[PDB]
Amino acid sequence: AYFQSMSRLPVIVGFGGYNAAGRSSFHHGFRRMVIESMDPQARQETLAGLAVMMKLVKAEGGRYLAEDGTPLSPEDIERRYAERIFASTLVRRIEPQYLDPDAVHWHKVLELSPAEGQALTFKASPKQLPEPLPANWSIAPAEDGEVLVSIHERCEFKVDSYRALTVKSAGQLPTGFEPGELYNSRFHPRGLQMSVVAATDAIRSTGIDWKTIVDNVQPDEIAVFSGSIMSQLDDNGFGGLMQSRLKGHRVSAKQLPLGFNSMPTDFINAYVLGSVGMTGSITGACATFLYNLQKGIDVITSGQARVVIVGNSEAPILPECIEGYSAMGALATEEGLRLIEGRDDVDFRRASRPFGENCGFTLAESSQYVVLMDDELALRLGADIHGAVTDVFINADGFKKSISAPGPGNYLTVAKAVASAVQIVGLDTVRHASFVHAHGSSTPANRVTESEILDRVASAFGIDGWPVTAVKAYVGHSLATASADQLISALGTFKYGILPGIKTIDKVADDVHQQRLSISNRDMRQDKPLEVCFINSKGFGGNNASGVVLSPRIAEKMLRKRHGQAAFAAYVEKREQTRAAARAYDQRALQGDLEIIYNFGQDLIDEHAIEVSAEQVTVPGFSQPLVYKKDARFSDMLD
């Protein structure tokens, strides 16, 4: 260290995934969020794609069929289905495919006592009786292998019972879209299904054959960083691990391994990419994706990896997660929303109200990935550029009281992020062509503390009217994946020049600090295109992060400057072909033809054919040898 020398620039060459707004690739999810602001062709295309995903129309030979068989144009689909599509996307009341928020199962303790008046007696299979038999219970032989049991003392049974959750809303994938139906997903937790399906969307969005990418780098130069913050807590993962015996049965052979928080990452190496490269799963509570992204940037700038898949997968819409967050007072409850609305019949579509009158966050599911390459490899392959990522800063809070309360670290991350952007694009561009993807979690603490940080950093850097957007208004809070939802939305702003409004609020709460911020409940189109986005995130445990994302225009200027006009022109030619391939994928995806990659048990490396020498390793299936890298770090310390 001291300072970093000239380095590879991380460019975003693909992105994809799924959240409550739909499919992320090609900006479809973004378009759903700003659907009314899009032109009709873009809107109708996205609506048609949602209709297919949701099984509202049948994709038949490039056309669309109603339940009647009636052929529909995209214009007809908007007329006929827009209301249903809108009602069955974004934050909304929790639907039965997850749970019934008025009837979740638990066990009550039922204390049964006998007394002088009536016997407490039953017949039972002896194999179902407690072991050892409770000493006070009577047992006698009965017919058909059963025994006659009588109880003489108070004891505790557990009985099935049903209760209502105080929280009724969540950010849910579009109703009817089922990731598990898209590949051989038997026994996989929902978070793993979502990771597999999202990863394929991201990889195919590049318009480049994965084989071509692998053939162009060393085997160790591919990296994947993903994971969840909860672990996979459904029945097929740690839910089964922790609950099976309390429900009367054994733990399965797969519940423990498939529950690990690294499995969204591990499944991508094992079944999607077939990578022998770098891997890891980094958590930082609700800033987790930016923690993974920091690692991704660092491995590119240090030269360790040239292709990086960075993302997360979280599927936390489960009664235990909801109760766990509720127990902290963290979530928007029905009663909380009743107070804000001043009526009993709440609009759960407005449960998430960043910077407005609000009362806690809304839990959501999402899996999102970006594909990064170094600039030189992107240039070589004709990879498209959706943006560039230059830094992520992470700072804890110092000493704390409550571990989950907000703290000062986010001052440091935002300040450092802005300063870093000034060095790269200049003060004027930061002042007049940057925006903030606010953490915007929809809590009274966040709206005050986050706005105060942004306002004070704005003042320090001489920014006024700093545009702020809050993706959680649309898709809720997907925990690990939250800042990936932010990043991907940001890319849509670069594409279409629209800053999504916070449409769920009627006005900004009176206690929000606004002097230097522009927070709107309407979509906005800036005269001067936005060139830089600051992604802001935080979580429990003194976790804070801010990321810097540059637009395609800025990134292209940078590649042109470094590589020159001849090399850039050659890149442009190759990129016309990769753009055509990507568009063809988007067209298939619109039709529901997603071709999920799940390569279980295929193309396994024969380890006995790995060749190791003192100069390199040859790995079966990889055309490029892994040549050990010459080290200059400590050369002055030697001899």
Chain positions 402 to 431 lying near its own copies, rule: CB under 8 A, are 403-404, 407-409, 411-412, 415-416, 419-420, 422-424
Interface with its own copies includes 613 (CB under 8 A)?
Answer: yes
From the CB of 440, what's the least distance to Cl ion, in Å? 5
Interface with its own copies includes 291 (CB under 8 A)?
Answer: yes
Q: Which of 526, 562, 574, 624 binds its own copies (CB under 8 A)?
A: 562
Residue 446 binding target from Cl ion, its own copies, none, CB below 5 to 8 Å by type: Cl ion
**Catalytic: which of 28, 188, 437, 477?**
477
Tally of CA atoms within 13 A in the half-sphere of 164 that contains its CB: 8
The three-class DSSP label of residue 194 is helix
Interface with its own copies includes 301 (CB under 8 A)?
Answer: yes
From the CB of 500, what's the least distance to its own copies, in Å? 27
The three-class DSSP label of residue 588 is helix
**Taking phi first (over 0 means left), then psi (-120 to 50 degrees means alpha), and beta for anything else, what does residue 619 get?**
beta
From the CB of 637, what's the least distance to its own copies, in Å? 4
Interface with its own copies includes 277 (CB under 8 A)?
Answer: yes
Q: Which of 70, 184, 302, 515 binds its own copies (CB under 8 A)?
A: 302
**Complex with Cl ion: residue 74 or 354, whichever CB lies closer:** 354
Residue 62 binding target from its own copies, Cl ion, none, CB below 5 to 8 Å by type: none
In the window 299-358, what residues touch Cl ion (CB under 5 A)?
A: 354
**Complex with Cl ion: residue 274 or 440, whichever CB lies closer:** 440
In the window 409-448, what residues touch Cl ion (CB under 5 A)?
A: 440, 442, 446-447
In the window 348-377, what residues touch its own copies (CB under 8 A)?
A: 374
**Using N-to-C axis directions, what is the helix angle for 444-461 and 409-425, rounded to 10°?**
40
What separation in angstroms does the CA of 244 have from each of 111, 129, 247, 322?
Answer: 23, 18, 5, 20
Pairing of strands 616-618, 611-612: antiparallel
From the CB of 125, what's the least distance to its own copies, in Å? 7
**Catalytic: which of 28, 286, 321, 533?**
286
Interface with its own copies includes 308 (CB under 8 A)?
Answer: no
In the window 207-236, what residues touch its own copies (CB under 8 A)?
A: 219-220, 224, 227, 229-231, 233
From the CB of 366, what's the least distance to its own copies, in Å? 18
The three-class DSSP label of residue 476 is coil
SS3 string, 8-61, reads CCEEEEEEEEEECCEECHHHHHHHHHCHHHCCHHHHHHHHHHHHHHCCCCEEEC
With a CB cutoff of 8 Å and minimum separation 6, the contacts of 430 are 418, 421, 422, 461, 463, 532
Q: Which residue matches tokens 């009176």?
A: 510
How many Å apart are CA 239 and CA 266, to the nearest integer? 19
Residue 275 binding target from Cl ion, its own copies, none, CB below 5 to 8 Å by type: its own copies
Interface with its own copies includes 324 (CB under 8 A)?
Answer: yes
Cβ-contact 351, 337 below 8 angstroms: yes
How many Å apart are CA 87 and CA 174, to the nearest integer? 9
With a CB cutoff of 8 Å and minimum separation 6, the contacts of 567 are 379
Interface with its own copies includes 136 (CB under 8 A)?
Answer: no
Range 142-150 contact pairs with CB under 8 angstroms and sequence separation of 24 or more:
147/123, 148/121, 148/122, 148/123, 149/121, 149/122, 149/123, 149/124, 150/119, 150/120, 150/121
**Complex with Cl ion: residue 199 or 457, whichever CB lies closer:** 457
Residue 299: CB atoms within 10 Å: 24
Residue 321 binding target from its own copies, Cl ion, none, CB below 5 to 8 Å by type: its own copies
**Complex with its own copies: residue 175 or 543, whichever CB lies closer:** 543
Residue 354 binding target from Cl ion, its own copies, none, CB below 5 to 8 Å by type: Cl ion
Closest CA to 99 of 250, 321, 312, 305: 321
Residue 614 binding target from its own copies, Cl ion, none, CB below 5 to 8 Å by type: its own copies
Number of residues that bind its own copies (CB under 8 A): 176
Interface with its own copies includes 100 (CB under 8 A)?
Answer: no
With a CB cutoff of 8 Å and minimum separation 6, the contacts of 336 are 359, 360
Interface with its own copies includes 140 (CB under 8 A)?
Answer: no
Interface with its own copies includes 515 (CB under 8 A)?
Answer: no
Interface with its own copies includes 184 (CB under 8 A)?
Answer: no
Interface with its own copies includes 6 (CB under 8 A)?
Answer: yes
* DSSP secondary structure code for residue 332 in this structure: P
**Complex with its own copies: residue 87 or 572, whichever CB lies closer:** 572
Closest CA to 126 of 108, 109, 144, 114: 144
286 is a catalytic site residue: yes
Interface with its own copies includes 115 (CB under 8 A)?
Answer: yes
- Containing H/E element for 123? strand 120-124
Q: Which of 138, 304, 521, 587 binds its own copies (CB under 8 A)?
A: 304
**Complex with its own copies: residue 159 or 584, whichever CB lies closer:** 159
Interface with its own copies includes 94 (CB under 8 A)?
Answer: no
Please report, in angstroms and rounded to a whole number, the separation of the first and last CA atoms in the chain.
21
How many Å apart are CA 601 and CA 132, to the nearest integer? 45
Interface with its own copies includes 152 (CB under 8 A)?
Answer: no
477 is a catalytic site residue: yes
Q: Which of 456, 495, 553, 574 binds its own copies (CB under 8 A)?
A: 456
In the window 80-139, what residues touch Cl ion (CB under 5 A)?
A: none
Phi first, then psi: give them for residue 457, nearest 5 degrees: -70, -40
From the CB of 260, what's the least distance to its own copies, in Å? 6
How many Å apart are CA 19 and CA 550, to the nearest integer? 23
- Containing H/E element for 260? none
533 is a catalytic site residue: no
Binding site for Cl ion (CB under 5 A): 354, 440, 442, 446-447
Question: Which residues does the annotation mark as catalytic?
Answer: 286, 439, 477
